[PDB]
Amino acid sequence: AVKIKLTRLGKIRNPQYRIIVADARTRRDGRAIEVIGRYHPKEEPSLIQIDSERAQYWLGVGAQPTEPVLALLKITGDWQKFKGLPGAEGTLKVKEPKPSKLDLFNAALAEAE
Amino acid sequence: TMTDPIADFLTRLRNANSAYHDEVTLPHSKLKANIAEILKREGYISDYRTEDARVGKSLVVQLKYGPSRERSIAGLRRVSKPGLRVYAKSTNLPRVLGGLGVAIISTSSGLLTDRQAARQGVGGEVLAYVW
Amino acid sequence: NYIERVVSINRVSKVVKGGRRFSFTALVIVGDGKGMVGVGYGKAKEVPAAIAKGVEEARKNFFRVPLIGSTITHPVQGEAAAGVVMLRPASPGTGVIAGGAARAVLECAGVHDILAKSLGSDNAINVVHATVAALKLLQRPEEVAARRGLPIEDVAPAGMLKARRESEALAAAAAREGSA
Amino acid sequence: PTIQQLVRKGRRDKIAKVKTAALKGSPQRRGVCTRVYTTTPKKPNSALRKVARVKLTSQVEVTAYIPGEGHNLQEHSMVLVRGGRVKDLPGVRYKIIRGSLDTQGVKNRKQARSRYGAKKEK
Amino acid sequence: ARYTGPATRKSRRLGVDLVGGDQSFEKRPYPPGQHGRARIKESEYRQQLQEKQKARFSYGVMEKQFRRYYEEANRQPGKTGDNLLRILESRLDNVVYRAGLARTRRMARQLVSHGHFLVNGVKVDIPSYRVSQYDIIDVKEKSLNTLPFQIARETAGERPIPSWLQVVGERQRILVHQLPERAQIDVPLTEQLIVELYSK
Amino acid sequence: GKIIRTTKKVKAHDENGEAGIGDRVSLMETRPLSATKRWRLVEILEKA
RNA sequence: GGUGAUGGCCUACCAAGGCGACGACGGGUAGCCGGCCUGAGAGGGUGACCGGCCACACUGGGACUGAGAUACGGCCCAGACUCC
RNA sequence: UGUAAACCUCUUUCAGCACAGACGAAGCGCAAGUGACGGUAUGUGCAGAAGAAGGACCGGCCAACUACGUGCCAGCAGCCGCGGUAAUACGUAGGGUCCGAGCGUUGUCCGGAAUUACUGGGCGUAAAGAGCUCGUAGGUGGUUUGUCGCGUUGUUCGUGAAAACUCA
């Protein structure tokens, strides 16, 4: 088959995956075709990013993703879109953009004065 | 025999510059003429012209010496020689003296110094270095 | 004020019926650190004597250098008896990169950022003479434009002129902070 | 030389002399000494220098030099070898590391103990 | 590895105060030892080495850490002396010293090594931590009871504080505005010698 | 960097036995027709 | 004829032709590569990790099966060694 | 030796002892539970300098000097080479320097080595011009008009897996 996988990367404690379209008869850290996304669960809001167009392409040609990636697709709405179930229900939580360094410094100044 | 007329040209100018001669004499060719015109532009020599001879034409060059007999041409050297034909991309053009001296390229746009060739974007065969 | 060097001391000997009438040599380089460079091969039975000869003879035989701020114009090959040297400009903040002899020469001259390489005749004497020949082969772009009639713009590229302008700015700054 | 010569024949390079051939690319080897004796160096240096004649496990019989000033070594003792030039001698390339498998850190050496194999006074 | 031996020793080895207020240096500024007076064969290598030993024993870095900093300074696109010196003054113990809450480089190294400070909301028991622009080094709760530190906050009208730094508070809240440059810093020996050393 | 002119034989095919020797030819590759017959003729091109 | 397929892959017959000093036929060594190390740079050495290919599975041969076999933990035979 | 020391203060990281105690799992299940690492990582405190520094070298290349013992010896060494009672070169002390949880040694490779030199070398005497001619393959080729545009050169497209490298 030609499945959608996750490949393990990083260093021994924190994983930092990628999202792959590759054959099933390969290995885990093996050859690829077209990476499309990635996934950082070691973070709490747990990054997700996908090129939805090319994802829908590989879903058209007859891919067959695994459970976790299938969950991520349900979240982002790509699976919901490919199947037209209600529609691309956007469930994704985005990380909080944390404060800006400059504003912090200037605020501390004005607070001191 | 003769095989390298351009080396003949250049070496003859070098010999005559060392002997402090005033004017030079060669047979004539289109390529030699274009070279001479470029040199007359860049400033090395005063003037050239075409006299003639028995069977064919002939060049005559008028050199350029300092007022205190300072030679204007320091050094001179052919690079792309038969055998080792050296070609040049615009990305990897030669730089002489940081760019002071002059390369002499032969290109689709004709003979051109390195700067003119770079501004056009072109590159091609190299022929000589001058300083 | 002058900077001075002692970069070679061999123990020579003429030979005569009694024995060996030894003597001492020296090689001395002088430089203001601004472009003046002088060289001298002094000798005597006395090391101070040879050194002082080298000093005064360097102060005789100066030679001005075509500098740009702190670096040379162009690379060059200098030939002496067999001393070969391939000098070449650096980019500023690089350092006076050379061995012993040429390092002495250039550091006394005032260079701060330059390359070099000895390729033959390891002897300091011929090395120094070759370096000097190279510095003579140098040319100022002004004199180049002079000898071939064209102006500096068609004669030089832009980066060298950037260096010229910026170094003149630093120099006027230094002098106007000094006196003015 | 011309470029046609170069393309037709080439630039055949030197081959440098392999130093220390008996060890077979190995830093050390293991050895057993068939003899144990001493030998004199060349005419300028007048002394009497220690020597062995070892059978290596690389199957080559070779001399060796014996640093320090004492040695616990007779024939058939099993020692370990390292490499080192000694200018005083014609045909010697190999030294012995002291403190391995039979040899002892020669005594009272308190400076440069690592090279001879003796311990620290606490 | 924190060197522990005397600072007077090396300050006499090269005949320069690296702490400043060294009365034993004032007494015996000449070198130490049985041959401290003896004469010298001069050379360029000597000075080039001497330079970096002065620097690294001023600050605390070891040779390998220093060489890494040097490769970084040469890798950067500026020029090596300025780049290196900025990178090297960026260290945190030197920062707090030049702010003045530390009396000595050793003391700063100790206070950081025991984790007394707090950088933008994370504990920092690390001395070689660098500080970029716009970073707010507040101090944690219990830096109070350190008695000469109380003396610091009270009467640190000692050695001046530079321009690119600042202190604005009762708990002595530190602030950085730029990274310095060479003409701004003006600390001991210039380092073309050092660049040349590692250009060897 | 010098230019090297080189030589290379080829073994090719004509169905009708046209071409003599000492000629100039056009050519195109085809699927292999024997062991070491790979190119074919397109135009017996410049006469001799 | 055969193969999933082109092919002396194989076969009967026919003509005798091909290869080569640009080094065939022989000999010695070695797994190839992205890359690694070094070096100013060209370039020199290298192929441990990580990843892609290739060959092998006690030694040498053979095939079935099945979409697909070098078939490691599958089969037949032959041999060495071991075991009841 | 050496501000080294005791000495009076201070800080308490890291180890040590007590308590708490994770994310890693928008996940798997349609059951009710779900962490091997892990009761660790990490914080909270607790008593206190308390438990914690060696290795190589010193005539020169190569920053680092004296004394002592031995005085052709023992022995050292990468090269130059040092030892015949006064050695800064051998072994020991003091001392100093370089490094620093490492330190030296060996082995191999690149470098320096412009010491296979394309960039970047030479052939009168330093090693090197065949004994001299003829000429096959090969290499190289005068002036000039036109043409092909293979080499060559400029642009754009595809590709040059990812990771490595370099920049943020």
Short mmCIF file of C-alpha atoms in Angstrom, two decimals, chain C residues 20-109:
data_model
loop_
_atom_site.label_atom_id
_atom_site.label_comp_id
_atom_site.label_asym_id
_atom_site.label_seq_id
_atom_site.Cartn_x
_atom_site.Cartn_y
_atom_site.Cartn_z
CA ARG C 20 89.32 31.86 13.00
CA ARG C 21 88.84 35.63 13.10
CA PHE C 22 85.18 35.51 13.98
CA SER C 23 82.69 38.30 13.41
CA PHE C 24 79.00 39.02 13.77
CA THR C 25 76.30 40.05 11.36
CA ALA C 26 72.77 41.30 11.66
CA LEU C 27 69.73 42.09 9.56
CA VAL C 28 67.72 45.10 10.63
CA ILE C 29 64.40 46.45 9.42
CA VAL C 30 63.00 49.87 10.23
CA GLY C 31 59.55 51.29 9.73
CA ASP C 32 57.51 54.22 10.95
CA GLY C 33 54.39 52.06 10.92
CA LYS C 34 52.93 54.30 8.19
CA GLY C 35 54.64 53.29 4.93
CA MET C 36 58.33 54.07 5.35
CA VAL C 37 60.42 50.90 5.26
CA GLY C 38 64.18 50.54 5.41
CA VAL C 39 66.54 47.60 5.37
CA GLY C 40 70.13 47.06 6.44
CA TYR C 41 72.68 44.25 6.63
CA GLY C 42 75.08 45.36 9.32
CA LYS C 43 78.07 43.45 10.58
CA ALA C 44 80.97 43.88 12.97
CA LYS C 45 83.01 42.08 15.58
CA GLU C 46 80.41 43.66 17.91
CA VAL C 47 76.70 42.88 17.89
CA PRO C 48 75.63 46.42 18.92
CA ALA C 49 77.91 47.77 16.20
CA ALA C 50 76.28 45.61 13.53
CA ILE C 51 72.85 46.52 14.89
CA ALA C 52 73.63 50.24 14.76
CA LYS C 53 74.93 49.92 11.21
CA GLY C 54 71.70 48.19 10.24
CA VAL C 55 69.75 50.97 11.94
CA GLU C 56 71.48 53.84 10.17
CA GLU C 57 71.51 52.05 6.82
CA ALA C 58 67.80 51.38 7.06
CA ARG C 59 67.30 55.06 7.88
CA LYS C 60 69.23 55.73 4.69
CA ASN C 61 67.42 53.34 2.36
CA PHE C 62 63.75 53.96 3.04
CA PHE C 63 61.01 53.10 0.56
CA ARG C 64 57.43 54.34 0.48
CA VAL C 65 54.57 51.87 0.04
CA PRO C 66 51.23 52.08 -1.85
CA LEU C 67 48.95 51.47 1.12
CA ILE C 68 45.20 51.68 1.53
CA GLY C 69 44.34 52.40 5.14
CA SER C 70 45.79 49.20 6.54
CA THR C 71 46.05 46.86 3.53
CA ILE C 72 47.79 46.59 0.16
CA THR C 73 46.18 47.17 -3.22
CA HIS C 74 46.68 43.91 -5.10
CA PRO C 75 48.44 40.56 -4.82
CA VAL C 76 51.88 40.25 -6.30
CA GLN C 77 54.83 37.92 -6.88
CA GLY C 78 58.19 39.15 -5.65
CA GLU C 79 61.40 37.57 -6.89
CA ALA C 80 64.82 37.99 -5.31
CA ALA C 81 67.88 35.72 -5.67
CA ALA C 82 65.50 32.86 -5.08
CA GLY C 83 63.07 34.39 -2.58
CA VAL C 84 59.55 33.96 -3.87
CA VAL C 85 56.70 35.67 -2.06
CA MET C 86 52.98 35.79 -2.87
CA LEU C 87 51.57 38.77 -1.02
CA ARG C 88 47.87 39.36 -1.17
CA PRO C 89 45.45 41.75 0.56
CA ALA C 90 43.22 40.68 3.41
CA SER C 91 39.94 42.02 4.67
CA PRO C 92 40.29 44.23 7.73
CA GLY C 93 40.59 42.62 11.13
CA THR C 94 42.44 39.61 9.68
CA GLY C 95 45.99 40.16 10.95
CA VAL C 96 49.57 40.41 9.76
CA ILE C 97 49.80 36.87 8.44
CA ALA C 98 53.38 35.92 7.58
CA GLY C 99 56.42 34.20 9.03
CA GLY C 100 59.25 35.95 10.82
CA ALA C 101 60.98 38.06 8.22
CA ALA C 102 58.02 39.34 6.26
CA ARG C 103 56.14 39.77 9.52
CA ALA C 104 58.89 42.05 10.77
CA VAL C 105 58.89 43.97 7.49
CA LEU C 106 55.17 44.52 7.31
CA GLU C 107 54.55 45.17 11.00
CA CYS C 108 57.26 47.82 10.88
CA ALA C 109 55.82 49.23 7.66
#
